[PDB]
Design a protein around this ligand. Sequence first.
Ligand SMILES: [K+]
Length: 438
Amino acid sequence: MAEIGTGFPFDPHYVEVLGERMHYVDVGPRDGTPLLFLHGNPTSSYVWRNIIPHVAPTHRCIAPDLIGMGKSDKPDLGYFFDDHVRFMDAFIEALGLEEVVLVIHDWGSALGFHWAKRNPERVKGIAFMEFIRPIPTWDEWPEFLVGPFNFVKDAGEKLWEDDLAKKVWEHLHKTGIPDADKVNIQVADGKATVAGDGLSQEAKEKILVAVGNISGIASVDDQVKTATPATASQFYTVKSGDTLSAISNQVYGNADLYNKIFEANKPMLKSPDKIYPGQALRIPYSLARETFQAFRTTDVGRKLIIDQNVFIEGTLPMGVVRPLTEVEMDHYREPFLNPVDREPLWRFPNELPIAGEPANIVALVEEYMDWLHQSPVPKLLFWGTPGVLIPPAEAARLAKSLPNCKAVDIGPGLNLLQEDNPDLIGSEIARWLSTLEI
Ligand SMILES: [K+]
């Protein structure tokens, strides 16, 4: 219940690493065991801005921008994980760090765990969140369920007591359902067919739900040919007594993602109070199978992430429960204003260890998971609900599996837990350091 700062009031520091300049934050005292904060994709040290001030009064905090990100230089690299390994190894040695406490997130966690496995004597504790683990099968993530889609026939807008299809299309047009101009409608015995192509997955889902939410429409036959889908939702039927908060609790496991559901159902839904029993709503998956399937290709994936900047304009806001402000979005946008600079954002999801590929990353991540499961190193695991990379059920398993591990529930959270509860994360790190022997 407190304001979250947007500013980045850290003096810039730069250091030569393998002939390139890396930017880093360096605050706090000069001489103790330092904390090394490692960010992931598509962030920078900016993601740590509201955590570090909880620790900097008593401990040195070092937060680098990965090569090719933040304010670091942008060499002509493929930006494979191994590139990041080489630069981060050289960064640590260029600063003369000996012993460290790691605080790591997302791809920063693969860097930190891989460095800790190789240098276990130099790691005094690891705080981590929304981290990389091997995913054995694609069915770890949900997929868009294929139609036909069934609706509560009598529920929705009454358009009446060839004619039916026209009233449906004009209703989509008048209510401003995006890309209604691209679809045509057929209605027969309460069954609607929606046909078209060139629609995004989001636009198609909004059209499908809007057609189903007409009084007298019992089912919608889905003939809408999309681009390659890069997100997906489930369809939820509103019950009597429902609120968006109750629906969020049921589907996401936490009530505080209510505004995500509201936003996902505009323009057809005008305010949260206006849901009605029998209404269908789209509820975006926290992480759809479609997303990394689309990203992990050299045609669709590069068009989305390089040409359209989807990791910054779409995926990043979907990784935060609260709405990011324009000031915050601009800080995240700044290193990637040129598309030619977006290579790391595409290579990173293509390095994720999913279903055996890429083999080198799968092996390396299994290796540091094996190390972590037998290591007595102090561990602090932050998790949120519903999560993205680490859902609550996985967090619970790891809290019991990992030795010497304290787990902290931060409340609602997706991928950037630092953007949803920085005060809890910073103050829990600060209290945990006193148990480390540093
Ligand atoms: K209906």
